[PDB]
From Swiss-Prot, chain B:
Family: Belongs to the peptidase T1B family.
Part of the whole protein covered: 20 to 130 of 241
Protein name: Proteasome subunit beta type-6
Localization of this protein: Cytoplasm; Nucleus
Species this protein is from: Saccharomyces cerevisiae (strain ATCC 204508 / S288c)
Chain's role: Non-catalytic component of the proteasome which degrades poly-ubiquitinated proteins in the cytoplasm and in the nucleus. It is essential for the regulated turnover of proteins and for the removal of misfolded proteins. The proteasome is a multicatalytic proteinase complex that is characterized by its ability to cleave peptides with Arg, Phe, Tyr, Leu, and Glu adjacent to the leaving group at neutral or slightly basic pH. It has an ATP-dependent proteolytic activity.
Subunit structure: The 26S proteasome consists of a 20S proteasome core and two 19S regulatory subunits. The 20S proteasome core is composed of 28 subunits that are arranged in four stacked rings, resulting in a barrel-shaped structure. The two end rings are each formed by seven alpha subunits, and the two central rings are each formed by seven beta subunits. The catalytic chamber with the active sites is on the inside of the barrel.
From Swiss-Prot, chain C:
Subcellular location: Cytoplasm; Nucleus
Superkingdom as given in the UniProt entry: Eukaryota
Protein name: Proteasome subunit beta type-4
InterPro entries: Ntn_hydrolases_N, Proteasome_beta2, Proteasome_bsu_CS, Proteasome_sua/b, Proteasome_suB-type
PANTHER family in the cross-refs: METALLOPROTEASE TLDD (PTHR32194), PROTEASOME SUBUNIT BETA TYPE-1 (PTHR32194:SF2)
Job of this protein: Non-catalytic component of the proteasome which degrades poly-ubiquitinated proteins in the cytoplasm and in the nucleus. It is essential for the regulated turnover of proteins and for the removal of misfolded proteins. The proteasome is a multicatalytic proteinase complex that is characterized by its ability to cleave peptides with Arg, Phe, Tyr, Leu, and Glu adjacent to the leaving group at neutral or slightly basic pH. It has an ATP-dependent proteolytic activity. This subunit has a chymotrypsin-like activity.
Modified residues (N-acetylmethionine): 1
Organism, as annotated: Saccharomyces cerevisiae (strain ATCC 204508 / S288c)
CDD domains: proteasome_beta_type_2
Lineage: Eukaryota, Fungi, Dikarya, Ascomycota, Saccharomycotina
Broad class of where this protein is predominantly found: cytoplasm
UniProtKB/Swiss-Prot annotation, chain D:
Family according to the record: Belongs to the peptidase T1A family.
InterPro entries attached to this UniProt entry: Ntn_hydrolases_N, Proteasome_alpha, Proteasome_alpha-type, Proteasome_asu_N, Proteasome_bsu_CS, Proteasome_sua/b
Listed name of the protein: Proteasome subunit alpha type-3
Domain of life of the organism encoding this protein: Eukaryota
Gene3D superfamilies: Glutamine Phosphoribosylpyrophosphate, subunit 1, domain 1
Extra remark beyond the main annotation: Present with 17100 molecules/cell in log phase SD medium.
Organism per entry: Saccharomyces cerevisiae (strain ATCC 204508 / S288c) (Baker's yeast)
Alphabetical list of Pfam families matching this protein: Proteasome, Proteasome_A_N
CDD domains the record matches: proteasome_alpha_type_4
Curated annotation (Swiss-Prot), chain F:
Keyword Nucleus: yes
Quaternary context: The 26S proteasome consists of a 20S proteasome core and two 19S regulatory subunits. The 20S proteasome core is composed of 28 subunits that are arranged in four stacked rings, resulting in a barrel-shaped structure. The two end rings are each formed by seven alpha subunits, and the two central rings are each formed by seven beta subunits. The catalytic chamber with the active sites is on the inside of the barrel.
Entry's family note: Belongs to the peptidase T1A family.
Protein name: Proteasome subunit alpha type-2
Misc: Present with 7060 molecules/cell in log phase SD medium.
Keywords, alphabetical: Cytoplasm, Isopeptide bond, Nucleus, Proteasome, Ubl conjugation
Amino acid sequence: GTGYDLSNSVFSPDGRNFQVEYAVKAVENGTTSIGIKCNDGVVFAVEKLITSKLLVPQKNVKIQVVDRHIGCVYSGLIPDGRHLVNRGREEAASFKKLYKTPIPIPAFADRLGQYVQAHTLYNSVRPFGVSTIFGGVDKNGAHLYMLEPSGSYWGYKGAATGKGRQSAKAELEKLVDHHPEGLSAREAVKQAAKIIYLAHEDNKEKDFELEISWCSLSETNGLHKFVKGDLLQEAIDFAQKEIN
Amino acid sequence: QFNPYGDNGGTILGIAGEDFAVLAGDTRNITDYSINSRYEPKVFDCGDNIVMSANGFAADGDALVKRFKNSVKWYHFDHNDKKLSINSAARNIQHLLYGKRFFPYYVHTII
Amino acid sequence: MDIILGIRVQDSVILASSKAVTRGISVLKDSDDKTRQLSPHTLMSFAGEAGDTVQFAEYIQANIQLYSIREDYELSPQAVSSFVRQELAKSIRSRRPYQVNVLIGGYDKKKNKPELYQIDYLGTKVELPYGAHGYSGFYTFSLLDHHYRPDMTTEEGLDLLKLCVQELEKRMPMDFKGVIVKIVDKDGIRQVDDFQAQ
Amino acid sequence: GSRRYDSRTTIFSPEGRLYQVEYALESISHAGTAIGIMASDGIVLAAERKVTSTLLEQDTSTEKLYKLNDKIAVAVAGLTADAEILINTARIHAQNYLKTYNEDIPVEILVRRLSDIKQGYTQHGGLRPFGVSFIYAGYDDRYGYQLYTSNPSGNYTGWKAISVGANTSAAQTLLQMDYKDDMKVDDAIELALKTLSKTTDSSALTYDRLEFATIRKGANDGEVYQKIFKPQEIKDILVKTGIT
Amino acid sequence: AGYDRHITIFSPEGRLYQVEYAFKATNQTNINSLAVRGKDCTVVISQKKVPDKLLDPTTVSYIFCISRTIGMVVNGPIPDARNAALRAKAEAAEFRYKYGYDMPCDVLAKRMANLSQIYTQRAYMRPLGVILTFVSVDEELGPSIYKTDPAGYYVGYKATATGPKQQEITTNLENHFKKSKIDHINEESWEKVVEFAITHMIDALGTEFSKNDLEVGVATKDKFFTLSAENIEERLVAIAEQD
Amino acid sequence: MTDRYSFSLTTFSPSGKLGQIDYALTAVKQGVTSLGIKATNGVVIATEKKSSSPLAMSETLSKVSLLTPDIGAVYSGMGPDYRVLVDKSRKVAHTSYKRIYGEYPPTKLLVSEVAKIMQEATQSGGVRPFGVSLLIAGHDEFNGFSLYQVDPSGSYFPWKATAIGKGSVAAKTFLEKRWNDELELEDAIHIALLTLKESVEGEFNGDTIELAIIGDENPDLLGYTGIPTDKGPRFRKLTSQEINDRLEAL
Amino acid sequence: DRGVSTFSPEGRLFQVEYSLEAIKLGSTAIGIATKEGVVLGVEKRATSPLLESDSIEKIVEIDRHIGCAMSGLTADARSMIEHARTAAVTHNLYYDEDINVESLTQSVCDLALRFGEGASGEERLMSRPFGVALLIAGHDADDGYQLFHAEPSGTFYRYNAKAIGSGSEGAQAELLNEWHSSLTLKEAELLVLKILKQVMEEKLDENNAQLSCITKQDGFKIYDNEKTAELIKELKEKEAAE
Amino acid sequence: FRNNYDGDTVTFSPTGRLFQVEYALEAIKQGSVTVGLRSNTHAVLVALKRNADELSSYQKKIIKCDEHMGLSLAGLAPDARVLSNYLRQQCNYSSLVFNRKLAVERAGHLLCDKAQKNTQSYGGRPYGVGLLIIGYDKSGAHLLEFQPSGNVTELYGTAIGARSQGAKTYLERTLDTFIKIDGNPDELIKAGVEAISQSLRDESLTVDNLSIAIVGKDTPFTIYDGEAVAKYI
Amino acid sequence: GYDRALSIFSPDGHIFQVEYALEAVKRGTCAVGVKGKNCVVLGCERRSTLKLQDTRITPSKVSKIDSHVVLSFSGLNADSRILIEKARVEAQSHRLTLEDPVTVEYLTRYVAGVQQRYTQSGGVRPFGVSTLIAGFDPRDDEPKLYQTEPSGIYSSWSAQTIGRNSKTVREFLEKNYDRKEPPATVEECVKLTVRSLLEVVQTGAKNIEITVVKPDSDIVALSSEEINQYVTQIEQEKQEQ
């Protein structure tokens, strides 16, 4: 008597939800993305596979914004990630409408958490095929979160998911020990470029494109902002400088 | 008590010859004894060689025109870019106006 | 209003109904049949608001006819008049109430007795030897109090109506263009062809 | 989704039978036998209680014979809980009819309606049918004494004598053998008890195992009277017939 | 002949396998918790395991502040745990609004255990794979501990323990209440009651604890609060001097 | 979110059996023994308090519940299913009766309402039957004292005396020998305690045994004086102390 | 089991493809478009000689300028025709003109995929696709004489000539060779009769086969039995000549 | 294997695949080939049309959505009608409420979000059609590819349908050439017809077989069929 | 709530739930209708299994839909009531809005439309019923006879039978009903109806029931003795050979 993996909300005999574990496989299959928490903000970076010369550069934007202060990035099924953000965007607007103040990051994290958890309670819905790294700056500092298909989320110093999660975490844990008194917003951006290049060894057959964003109290006034032109080129050159 | 209607004045005219038609209207828009605008166009080319004007309450006029223009647009999408004949437009406008028989558009309309 | 009269005699119910349909300053019709047959032995007359009047009658008629087909049986006049009352009693507390006053004239084939029921738009039923709706009653009720006997023949009952119609024609302000008269007995419903000059 | 767990209660077999209606009829073939016999001067209803104990209170007990109207009564075969659901709607229906026409409901009209409710659970809704068969005993001024039967399919028929529940096949032949059209009620009482006594799966037929009722016109009153026999009354009539 | 183990319907034996399999889920996180009553306080202790050095330890918690007076510790996966929390918080606020007084501990438990029983009966809802332990100092009943499971069962406790290594802790406490005779910790201050609970978790699990290995929640008259790493650290100094 | 379970979960099998009802009854057999006895001047319902832990407080968990001032209930089977049924049974007594008639429902009618709720659990979409048998004891002016049993199917039977759960077979035999139509209430409690002893393996006292009666009106349990017609509840849960007294001379 | 609207590994909808097999079991229906009009013919196919043949209605008027021929589960067509007629009359109410044949067909096809079990997007309350294919023939001022074949897949093709039903594969091969741009109406009428006669199991007469046409002048007419009998009599003579 | 996990879209396979979505993708691969390509001034669609018989018409592949935007289809046409209708309304809403021509990128996000809801809910199937959306908004010429999984990519050139891998390789090799074709629409159509013929394994492209659409700086979205496309043959 | 698709297509192109609804009809008691020059006659068989029925109160197979139209059926008895009621409501509704009783064709088309609707709606199964609808149009003296089936298909017949052993009785009518010269008299038309049922039903005056509908709402069901007389005459024809 089996078939415990055919329906979503069902508990297997050992106590698991196999349909969520199958969603995790869809995430591991996806492009690698990371988050670094610094001394006054958060930095997000993501890999973008260039299948053909035909894809217009800088145009297929993956990192998304909720409100004006939160940034979101995800690995796995992109449409699912987009759907999750549409929910977050509605959720934050609703919060701002009633309490005037923009949503705190811990508050926003649970809003995603309860919503993703909800999609593991019924057989008529499919679990989310994404892990989401997200954060920002609120009333009491920077926050970084990672949300799994089960609905599990925690606060992170550094987060990684997708194809090259192994290389990323190994490099993130070295930063926590080498920089015990925090890392600066500028530094974290440059360092985020390196991690993405090092995690690209896992997908080294194809060419890729770098996309970075940051939210910082001193460098961006606590608002989410993309990295462009001279700052992005600086990060690209730094990653190239530490590869040889 | 809130009155949903107002009066923006103006006047429009429509004459048809043998191979032509004209539709005219003053450009003055008013509220009570004040002039809102000295140049506020009130006669519109709706496409398919139809000119339209709705006169009276300007907010109901603009709504009607806007709704009919959108009607022309969808007619092309639905009926293989078929030209909307003036008689068809007329019957279509009747249904727009009568569809608000119990909260009317305070306009006199001419095409 | 319209004239709506009924009288139960020994072995029949007689219904007399106004023939005129007046709207505004014009008498639009002088031959209007203000009655419906509900079943072979039950007849209903009606008066009231312009539209409600025919719509209610025809609606009641469809329901009684539906009952007859389903059951292969005819409801007693008592049962029909209870159904009518409850529809009006329902309608008076709705958004737009039927403004219709009716008379049910029926011959109960089981009991071998004629029956007359007066029911107003509120759903106020009562069984009577004689009845009237509208202003008509203000003249005919006292007239019948005097002249009516409970064992009168159908022929005596028609004479007694003529006396009511003569009084209404003399004293009532409106020209109601005479009446259509119907008999309900053991043999069903029939119309008295000549009453206008009987 | 839920498609996996749907029994499909309202579908035809390749043979053209309704699976659930069939299995419901099988369920009823296990229920205590009930008998109804219509005579010229009244109707009898006899029923056999199932799995009785000496500690079971009979005085307060009423499991097979129910009063629907002041003039209509029923014998039940099958699930008592299912039957009570229907019995209540039937009681409401008779009262609606009375409030509408100022006349007691004709027996057939009450039967057609219950039978219509049962037919519903057969054709739509995806719910299980009612596991009940009824005998109806009634009187009205149109047909006089009437006897009807209805089963889970919503089919109803009219009878001079009928049995429901267990051993109907055996019970019907015994009735067909001993029933004559010009029967007095006191004779119909005997036939009902004799038939039960023969088809019983118990050792002997006793008062504590029986429910008994009559519908008879007043021996002096001139109108219709129901009588649901009390334990002591049955014990009396069981000595009369010759069963003790 | 198979599907009676996938949704919440009876097996031939009379068992609801989905409920049984939900109990299994409660031990997934390998964390043990215990709750004890003092003279006028109630203390919850839960093991804090942060295996990843990329995590922010301050966010790793299975103890929730439901209301000003009520606190809850959860044994089970966090997404189900947070689900249960949000509901309890909502239910506690609604009670206060409707009835004008703060929801009691035993009443919140009964409520949450009723909701758990629904998922047990209706098929479209899966049970939550969590065991909820509620604590407070009730204004009528005094110090209270009430525990709800995925079966919808709930009961009051003198003291309780939950998790994989539950029985070690359970027997350890049982033996103390046969020795002390009274059914609570005979101590005036909550600080010494927290110390008792930590001492008895060490002796039952056979393992020493640091300030980051523990999570503590305290309930006093009109207040429930969770201790910081340093409050525990101060409390850990006290047990080291006693031995 | 979208409940796709609009169909029955309890259906008929080829043999005629209703699987889920039968299995529910199987769950009731595993449950702890509970019993009821009807005397001439009262009714008694009794059960064993099976504790889940010696650290748990058995006082916080009542297996015997008051439904109305004159009606009480006990069960065998699944505890949580009973708890939610008790809540609904208390509510229906108000909504479907007291709010209409200004008085409490008679025993038979409240039982009928309880049964209806359980019958619905047999037929409604997306639910399983309740896994409990109930024993409901009560009084009403026009019927006097009565005792009912309600099965998972929704069926109910009136009993002079009966037992449900684990040792019900042996306990029904023991009751048959001891019951008569001339029992006084103190006699009935005596039998109740004796019958329950055959079931209980462990400690037998007022802390492990739950016992309540439907007897005389208790004016000191009412809470107020003034209205002569209000005389007080007939339902009374015996205390641990009161049970022990009858056990010292047992 | 398996979902109703569910793709096969090949990329097709199970229900739609199975519905296409029900249509292949239907009666033959033939349409031929000419510059003088469109002709629609059907095989009646009566199951018993006691059946009153002229009560078999497989040719229906949609509007004065649009006609329809059905093949397959013909009971399924009633609500399609009802929709079609209402669409046509409704269009005339809003626009004081005749509906285009192309737009009418599109409106009928919009219904075809509205099946499922309480789905996402809009509202689709229908348990299965239609088990019937339609031949829609008509005329409008814009595109002249037109013949459309509407399928339960929701897609519709325009045809110069089309056969649907049991004899459709053999009939379409025949219609491929015969049809040319400059056929007369009478040639087309005789052509419909010629192909139906071939694919039928029974001998063709004015009772088991029905003719109809749509012209600009007289609109949509269904030929009476006496008229069709004379065209059958005329076809017999022409085949015998060569 | 595949037996169990392809019953509906709501179900994940052990490897993380949604088979119902993948089977929908297969309908596109069976569909007739179509090609998109853009420069800085203009965007172009070139589509190959399919018939049933030589007695049938060729089904239309290109749909106009607004004066500045449009799309081509490969797969189930009824689904393309449902999606194009939606995008028309979204374009309509943007003009009426905001007096704003909907940005092509946002059109893609909306189609992505609409496709997604079908891939996660019980009952509903996925869409069975691919789309190539060309536009000219406030930031120049755009080309988008839509897959019924939800994925939408902005490209210079691309192809979908049967044998479309041939056309895609041609564009990938000619990228530097056609992107500079600014202010000469004819020489961009010439590049599209040369692209689509790289996918012709079966037949020659004829006057009632070929379909072309163009949008640009001073060119509202227009479709060419019949004698209009004759010069590109 | 419940909208599960019960009637669906199978690989070979059949709706099995509709196919099985026909099997239910094949199990039902035989029904036959024949039309004459100036009448229509409906014949139906009663089951012999239980010979203790009360014919006064037992529902009969021939139901009046209106005063001029009759409906007989073969299949699930409980299902037929649903179809009959809807038809009877539509009859009264048609008299209300059109001011004219239904034509037999119209009432047939409506009943057939309901049946079809239950073959492509969610949560419902097809009607296990085929009907014979017979009567006379308002002010019309031409006889009308129609048949419907679970699929929703309908058509008119000179003579038709449905239900068990209907293959046998149809075979009889095909070689016994002359379209050129229909039965001239009512008596001549009733004889043929009884003759056909005697092919499938063993000697039974109880078993065969007949109803005769004439123009202008003249419907009368025959007594057992009257039908018995027809049987008595027919059985004496055979022995002459």
